[PDB]
Amino acid sequence: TSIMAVTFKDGVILGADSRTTTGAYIANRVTDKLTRVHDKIWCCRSGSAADTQAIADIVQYHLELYTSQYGTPSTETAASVFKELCYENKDNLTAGIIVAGYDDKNKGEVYTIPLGGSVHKLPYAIAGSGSTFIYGYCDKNFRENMSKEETVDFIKHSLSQAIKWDGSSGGVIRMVVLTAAGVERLIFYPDEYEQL
Amino acid sequence: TSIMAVTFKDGVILGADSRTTTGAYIANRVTDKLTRVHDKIWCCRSGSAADTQAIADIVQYHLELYTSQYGTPSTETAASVFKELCYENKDNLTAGIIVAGYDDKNKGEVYTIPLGGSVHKLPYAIAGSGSTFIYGYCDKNFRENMSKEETVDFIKHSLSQAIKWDGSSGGVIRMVVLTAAGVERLIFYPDEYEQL
Amino acid sequence: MDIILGIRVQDSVILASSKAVTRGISVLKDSDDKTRQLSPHTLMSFAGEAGDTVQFAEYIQANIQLYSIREDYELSPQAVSSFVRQELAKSIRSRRPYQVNVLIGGYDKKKNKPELYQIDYLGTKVELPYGAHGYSGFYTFSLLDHHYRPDMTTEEGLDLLKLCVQELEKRMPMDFKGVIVKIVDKDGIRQVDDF
Amino acid sequence: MDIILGIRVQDSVILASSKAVTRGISVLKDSDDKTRQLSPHTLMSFAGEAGDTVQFAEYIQANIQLYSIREDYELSPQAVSSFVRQELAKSIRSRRPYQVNVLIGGYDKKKNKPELYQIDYLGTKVELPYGAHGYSGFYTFSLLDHHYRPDMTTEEGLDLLKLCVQELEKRMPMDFKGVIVKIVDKDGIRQVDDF
Amino acid sequence: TTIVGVKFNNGVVIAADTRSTQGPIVADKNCAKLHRISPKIWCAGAGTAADTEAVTQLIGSNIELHSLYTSREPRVVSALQMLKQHLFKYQGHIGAYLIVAGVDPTGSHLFSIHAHGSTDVGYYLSLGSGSLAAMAVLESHWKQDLTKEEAIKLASDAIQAGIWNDLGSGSNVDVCVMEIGKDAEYLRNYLTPNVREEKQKSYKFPRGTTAVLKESIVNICD
Amino acid sequence: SDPSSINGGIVVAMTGKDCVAIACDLRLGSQSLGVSNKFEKIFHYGHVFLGITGLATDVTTLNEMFRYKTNLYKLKEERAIEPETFTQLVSSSLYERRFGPYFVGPVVAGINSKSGKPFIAGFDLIGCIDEAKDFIVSGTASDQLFGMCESLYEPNLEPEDLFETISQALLNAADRDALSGWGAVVYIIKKDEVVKRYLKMRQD
Amino acid sequence: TQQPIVTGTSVISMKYDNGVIIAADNLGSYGSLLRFNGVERLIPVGDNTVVGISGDISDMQHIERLLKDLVTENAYDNPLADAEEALEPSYIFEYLATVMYQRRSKMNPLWNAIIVAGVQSNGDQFLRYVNLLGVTYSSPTLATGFGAHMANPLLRKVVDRESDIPKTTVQVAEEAIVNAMRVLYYRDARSSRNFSLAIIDKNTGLTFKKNLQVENMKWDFA
Amino acid sequence: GYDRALSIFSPDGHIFQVEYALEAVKRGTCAVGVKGKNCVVLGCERRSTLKLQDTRITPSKVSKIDSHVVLSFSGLNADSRILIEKARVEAQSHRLTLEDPVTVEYLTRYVAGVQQRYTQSGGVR
Amino acid sequence: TTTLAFRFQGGIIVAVDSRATAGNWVASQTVKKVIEINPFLLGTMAGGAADCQFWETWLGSQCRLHELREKERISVAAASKILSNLVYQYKGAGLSMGTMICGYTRKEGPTIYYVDSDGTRLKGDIFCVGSGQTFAYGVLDSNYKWDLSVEDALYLGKRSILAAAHRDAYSGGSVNLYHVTEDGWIYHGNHDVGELFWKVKEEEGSFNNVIG
Amino acid sequence: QFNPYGDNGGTILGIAGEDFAVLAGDTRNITDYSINSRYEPKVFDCGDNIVMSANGFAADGDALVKRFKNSVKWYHFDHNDKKLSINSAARNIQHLLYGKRFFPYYVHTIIAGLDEDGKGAVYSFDPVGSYEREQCRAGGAAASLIMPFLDNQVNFKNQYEPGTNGKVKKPLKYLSVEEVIKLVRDSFTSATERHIQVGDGLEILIVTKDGVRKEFYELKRD
């Protein structure tokens, strides 16, 4: 995998490639690694596919039960539930998850949760095997309070490079936009992003 | 290590950090990884320090003996001698070497020689542990026929990022400029490059 | 432990069991009786891992004696052998299995017939005219294949047994310090003192 | 292989060596002579790895016999032992070392004295009043510490040796099928046939 | 072991501690780790003790023969080249870690050599188990344009850091000063800050305390 | 299967006022089994004394080797080898077997016949020279010997007093080691007389 | 049984006449990758204690939550929670030490090395160490990881024993700490330039300094 | 699990459930034991309101606990089987660990202890 | 360790050494390897020292509880079987014990049981247990008769430990002697090998391998 | 894989007199080749005139001492403030140690005090609970260096009466507290010279009928 989430002026955008790997064989070239845990709280998934699904499903269950009792959960709360599962089961899990959500009070927020189960709140986050190749690019090109179109271009260009160098990444670039307006799904095909 | 070599309009420039490692201890923070094998043929060194020295010393000896009999060797010839040593002794070596030289007929040339001992002629090359973090950046920012000042900035910015993310890289950024004019040594200190 | 043999003849079952107990480079005892009387007409010999052997033998002995008191009746050799097999069959899938191999020689009073059962530590039961556990069988089985007849007397069985001990004393690497021989027939269990 | 003993008394050296040759669960031979005459007044017993033992013994024998013919003279027991030690000392750092332990019993005609040398496969030489290789020593050394005297006769030495064999036959795990006993004195080497 | 090397105005100085160990046991409380390759080229060695001594003697021997052959005073880069090619050939199995320093017609020089055959240059270096303690001091107090007396002070201070803080190092401080145009000045036990205190008691036994079985005169003459 | 502790044994050397002492135990065993109580570990070539601990086959081999070499030395040089020179010869010979070494812990002791200076030295298995003013220790009870020597030793002891010190150092060290003991020998060495004494010690 | 993933390097500290100083850089390493740069590894408890943590960051964050919860629990039914019955440095340490040793005994350790620095209610300086093994010790200077090898030697030149503590001012002490951090940046391959520093004084109280940088570095000799 | 304390003290200091158990014994058929100089004899009554019985298979009143000890009883027949079984098991267990059969005093002491345990355990009569 | 105990005409002799080792390091020379369970019962220790020390003193507590409950001293058979059944429960866990339960009762007479940590329990007349057991066997077996006098039996037991103390590197220190009769056990002193060896060598004329 | 044990070095020593007993130990604490503390005491007064030290892995050592101190406290609560005799303490410590037979406390334990007749007593334990009363015992890293010296000087082993042909042994006698402290100091200075994990400081606890006294002495810090 190559995945990322980036905060901007109006909220936050999540991004991901679509490649699933069992060795050098691509088990699925049209995978959806961006997953809904709540209306406007989404996660990006990397690592074991079974582990990340089991976690995301449990989180979705927890936040659905939270909502029934206490109303809409904060993005921080969602990240805490992910952390609790990843930290307490660190010996049996291979899951690198980025959590991203939109509040009206807090606007866009991004939390990254690496292998150990630590939590790190950041302006933007990158993860997955392909992220290694874009640390340099992303650090040089990220700015705070970008526009929607700028942030889309930042993610598109970033994942394009990650895909170009990482054999474990490829296919389409999926994106999910989280703002006050609602939820928007974007897709970008090889013929566009390859020749950037 | 983080190392690179880049061809441009007037010739070629080599670049390198100055860190030597034995684990997490920095055995030398002012290392010179850019090495002369001939007047205007230089190499960048990565991997084992003992292996890369033994190789570079043998190459320098071979090219000195070549010069005594047949005059100035081509950059391709120098790369072939490096290859021959790296390929035939692949089981006992850990050496990633970039060869770079200036001819008057061929201008600037860059050859990279990875672990296996294969040869690859390229417009520019990156290598060492820290190179992983700048594949994205370098691919997006490299142009052919750059000027001296542009190429210096490209290398300075690139190695700055490699140093920033790679713990195995750091110290000063050394550079060696190869043109018809001659040989120029450049050095850049942390206080400058860190805040780029 | 090591050598335990068994021969079923016309009217009796004869068990021979080695007397040596060895640990390291020392023979600690040369008069060890590797057998327990389970009931008046049933005898069990045993060999295997140190400690396990006696612990298992005495545990079976206690259970059969308990049964005898409860029902005021003696279990058949076939019934006792099946009980023993099941205990070993349980044991093999335990946390720490009993590493014990046994022979059960008995006289069925209802059938008026001798019976010899060979059971290994896995719980593998077979009824046989003659039996052996461990390396002993590699010599004795072929010997008995040749010399054994089904209609032999107890005396003929003892001579046939002497032939086995002689062969083992000639070709076996270890000194097993001779054997204790016991006979099981219609009148119960008795020991041959001069062998 | 296994049991080799040696006792030096007033006027002679006595070597006792087991007769068994065992491979797997079979005693292949019970009359094996684990010794070679190196010279008229020098005898070497041996024990260790199969094949190596005889190959080494005969190789030494050939060399000493060659020396005897060349010089028309018999090497002293001390000289022969040193030659043997050096060969084993070379061997231990070879590609495939000789895994052979030896005792050398000899009578020095110039000194008119018996001599017993114990040498292991590493090339570790010691002169001793009594010696043993392998597990035998764990019983015999303490026994001889108690019963041995330096001024004993050959007959007293043989009785002392009988006491060692009896102890080994009682406490050793393996059947070594008795021993062949040989005496080395002023008149050369001879074998005791009834032991 | 703690060894250091420091460059100054008109030359170079090296230093070392004097503790030799076998495991956690101190074998020699005053061993000499400063070796002579040639009159004005000296070596400080850490690692496998026999290897550092043997490799320093072999190259020292060949350097002498080379000096006689060429009618020239030996250079530090020659010792450096010979040592590194020798150590490389043995793929690290010869556990010699050296700081090489000296003066020659070319000038003053300071190098380090690691067991696999890698060499490096510097104005200040430290090797051995106490190298981190020494390097901390060197990184804190080193400056460009040191005098002779300043460099000796810095070098010995770096060794002291190893002596006190590293269990692999102890006892005394040896120093060797190699200045251009002058003879090399070897200062054995330049510092001795670890003198054993007076014992509380004399353990001299009354004569006859030891039981004896046999006496005999030994012949050492022909 | 650790070559240096199969057979067992110890050697110690000390300096005194115009004299030196070298001592050793007499045990040779095979792990737990004690085999010989007559196995001396100190040898001499002229006036130079060499003690060797470790694997017994190598102890014997090296003695024979250094007798060989010192005999040729004397024939060619027309003089007896001195302790300083012999120490170097031992070091050279051991390092020659760098990657296939003799499993030994040798100790040189003697008085230089020209200068009259007492000299002792020790080595590891591969030839590293350990020179000392005071004492050298070796063998399976080297820890024990280090402790005894460090506490008992004082400088400039007279030959008779030095004998008591080195003997007590060896005996009490040997009794805390399973593989050492079974008898002991002490050499007292003056400029032109050498006394050898066998010590009474516990035989367990 | 664990393996540490995201890690923090050295934590260094020392006592001075009126209190204690402690420091640690702001890096969260992911192997050789210098992944996270905004990581605070000094965590204050009340106005009289600072806990410095190195090692696994997920376990560090767990320990943060424990200390946070300890403050909450101590306040329950406690009218003197901000006075005589406030949390002391000694209480906080012993709690952590108990947890660390219990976790090692269950073969599931918190993969950390911890230094608790503070001032007691009677004015006494508190400085004590504990790690994943449950090992505890105290000293005038304490440091973890590389700090143990390179910082301690430098800090011990200022305060070598107990009697040196009254003679050491806060100015001199902070200077030594800041210097040590520079040396670690030169020589530790998992250090960052940015760090935090905390002073706990018996008179002026807790001073927490964020976003400090290593400066006045020497490279020109390259 | 059923926990009720069925055997309890009354104001006058009696445990009625234990005393009512004695009434069940009083209802049972008579049993007598007489010991001589070299023997003991156990005699037992069998009520004759039961004709058409099969005496071959009907449980005997005197039970062997081991080859050397016997037990007879008066009271509830079903209850006695539980005591006899436990006693028989303890007899074999004693032989196994002590390598000696039980004494009559020991076997009695065990059986009596079982009876006592059922007078101050919850959920049992 | 080397320990022995043998049965004879005049009861039981029990003899043990007193050395403790941690590898080749001689840890102690003054160890008590005989435990006095009651005036009629003795236990010998060989192998793991904590294992032996802890469980044999525990055995003593179980024997005391037996005589409180049963108003009668425990049999040697029953005492030995408590220990063997205990160690059998721990089989595989890594306990290391070579013990001998020696004593007298009316019903049994003089009795010796060998009990070890893999669950082996053996009645017998002669046993030697420990790293130096073979050295003890050599001397004991070659001099043993049933008709030995109390004086001669005591010496043979002492002499057999001495033999093992000498040859076995992991045995030594001193010899502790015990004699068990119908009236109970009797202690026959601690005998340091330092003096005992030379005394025996001189008086007996044995140990000719050693330099006199 | 996680290793739950460590080695904190150091060494301890107990000697018993006629009406007194001493328990000494160095104050150095180490891991690998680094010093953690120059003064970290490991000899403790546990009450009832019992002093205790558990040397080896300090975490296990502190845990054990802590549990025994607690055992003394509950012994008073449960048995009407009765004094815990040294023999009873020893047996209690066996059960503490053996309770972790299959996951041992990695320590050599020594306790000292007076027996119920007022005479000096020293008990020593192996890691799993084996114990024995002695006149003399050294423990820890340098035990192998010190113990044979104690055999020679306390119990007069290998010492015979002069002129008696090695027939009469030197008679055993109790040593004065002055003589014992001389032997302790000499034992530790000798151990400091030849063992790298031993040094810094020596702390002796002396036990008489009047109570527990302390004495401290400097040791070499290299």
Ligand SMILES: [Mg+2]
């Ligand atoms: Mg960096």
Ligand SMILES: [Mg+2]
């Ligand atoms: Mg000894």
Ligand SMILES: [Mg+2]
């Ligand atoms: Mg012994």
Ligand SMILES: [Mg+2]
């Ligand atoms: Mg020290």
